[PDB]
Amino acid sequence: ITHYIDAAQITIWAFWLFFFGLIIYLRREDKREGYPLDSDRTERSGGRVKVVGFPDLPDPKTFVLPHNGGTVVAPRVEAPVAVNATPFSPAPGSPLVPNGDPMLSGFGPAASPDRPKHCDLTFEGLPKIVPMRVAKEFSIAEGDPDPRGMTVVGLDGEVAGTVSDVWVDRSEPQIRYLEVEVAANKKKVLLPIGFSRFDKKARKVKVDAIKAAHFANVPTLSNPDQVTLYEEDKVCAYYAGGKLYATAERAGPLL
């Protein structure tokens, strides 16, 4: 006997039903941050219309933090935060332009959310990211130079200061920040390893993100022996603003 329907055809159709169900599941999970959307439709509706697209948002999940750190929920209602910028044009879809000195505006690649004002912790409950002054069990791996005492140069090759310490991850041993004693003001500021190139034979750290004089305004730590999530983002974002803001040419275009 012959039939057009066969088991291979049945099974492939069954797969499509599963797969489209899976995609809808995934798109819901994708909306646990950043939704509902900031639109001009919600503004004029007086907030009546929430823009969420399809599928709609999932019910909130809870993240229980260790060491009695509290509970995080997702999705969550997050308060609007003023933008320190003015639109270049009033038309929708236009960019904005930072107010004041761009490096210091907290806008564009200088921007960042306000992370929590407590430190990431080791499993045992100590501050995770700390200078080698504090975690004395750490050493420099034999074969590699000690960054302490190296001179830090900005994007234009001028001396910004000297490395005064190294900040390490106690959970997963690696350098996360260099501590820079800034020549101009004698403050000690963090420098993320992600923005640092070593010139080993010269014992120099090169920082392409900012000029030497920009080190004077790197955001400062409340406590010299630990760093909060909040301060980590403020530090890293300040260097990143330099990628677009630190010189005029960086605005573009090429042509």
């Binding site: 055809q9 941050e33 791996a141 997963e172 992600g194 890293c236």
Partner: protein
């Protein structure tokens, strides 16, 4: 110029971590950890320690027996000549039993060793699955790894056990050998009328390509935000930072939508898992349900048609 965060320029050292303490009933870990400078250039310099209870000890014993039976038979097939074993290594193999034996345990001289290696490798893998399950349980972690491992085991089982049993013959299973298992792969497509026309083969390719697409995207995305600590995905997930915001906006502005730091790992999980689910289903249907995938595709209207520029008289017709 900028630091790309591909290689660690300056490593630091601390006393080796012995690991998160395990609950009562777990055995103490074994090994004195060492440090590799060159591994420390690309990743973690620490090697060891390792956990080894009953599950893993049994797994490793079964697995070494299986591997040794294969290597032994390869060397015997060049008459113990170690130099010819190195010459022909990629060609040598441990061969499935002849078709005359069906699914019966075949003689030691002609297929018994294949059947024993498949049995003992399979038990070794199943026990390794239990190991991945137990190691998550002892740390209080969920079982995502063992579920994905089970999907790969499903495909492996279909190749060497389920389909051969359904088809009535160990001779239809896979040989243990480098080039021999490539012969088997090509011959399987030939025998079943071109695996390109198997729709679960097409899906498995979409998901294998998609896995490389997604790890290239995600790997590169995270390194581009590692300057903001984006590689620390636990705290970016509980406490969204500018790493996670910039990652999502890069993709939203590029292609119109984006995921979250947690949910990209769900996309990645399913893409990889569906590679081997669809692969198992595709092989499971070959020979049992569909005997010629090209003709199955003709029947369901899928095969392209071309202007005829070559053609051959069938001498069986003449």
């Amino acid at each position: 110029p900028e630091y790309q965060n591909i290689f660690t320029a300056v490593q630091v050292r601390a006393p080796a971590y012995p690991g998160v303490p395990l609950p009562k009933g777990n055995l103490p870990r074994i090994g004195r950890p060492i440090f590799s400078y060159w591994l420390g250039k690309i990743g973690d310099a620490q090697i060891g320690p390792i956990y080894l209870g009953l599950t893993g000890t049994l797994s490793i014993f079964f697995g070494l027996v299986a591997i040794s039976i294969i290597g032994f038979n390869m060397l015997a097939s060049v008459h113990w000549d170690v130099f010819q074993f190195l010459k022909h290594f990629f060609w040598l193999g441990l061969e499935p039993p002849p078709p005359q034996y069906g699914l019966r345990i075949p003689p030691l001289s002609e297929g018994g060793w294949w059947l024993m290696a498949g049995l003992f490798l399979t038990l070794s893998i199943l026990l390794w699955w239990v190991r991945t399950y137990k190691r998550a349980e002892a740390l209080g972690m969920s079982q995502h790894l063992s579920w994905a491992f089970a999907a790969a085991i499903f495909f492996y089982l279909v190749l060497g056990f389920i389909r051969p049993v359904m088809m009535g013959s160990w001779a239809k299973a896979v040989p243990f050998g480098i080039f021999p298992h490539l012969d088997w792969t090509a011959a399987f497509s030939i025998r079943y009328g071109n695996l390109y026309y198997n729709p679960f083969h097409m899906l498995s390719i979409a998901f294998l390509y998609g896995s490389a697409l997604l790890f290239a995207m995600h790997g590169a995305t995270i390194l581009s935000v590692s300057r903001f600590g984006g590689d620390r995905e636990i705290d970016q997930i509980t406490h969204r930072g500018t790493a996670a915001e910039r990652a999502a906006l890069f993709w939203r502005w590029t292609m119109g939508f984006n995921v979250t730091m947690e949910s990209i790992h769900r996309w990645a999980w399913w893409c990889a898992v569906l590679t081997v689910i669809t692969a198992g289903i595709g092989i499971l249907l070959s020979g049992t349900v569909v005997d010629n995938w090209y003709l199955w595709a003709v029947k369901h209207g899928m095969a392209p048609a071309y202007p005829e520029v070559v053609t051959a008289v069938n001498p069986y017709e003449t």
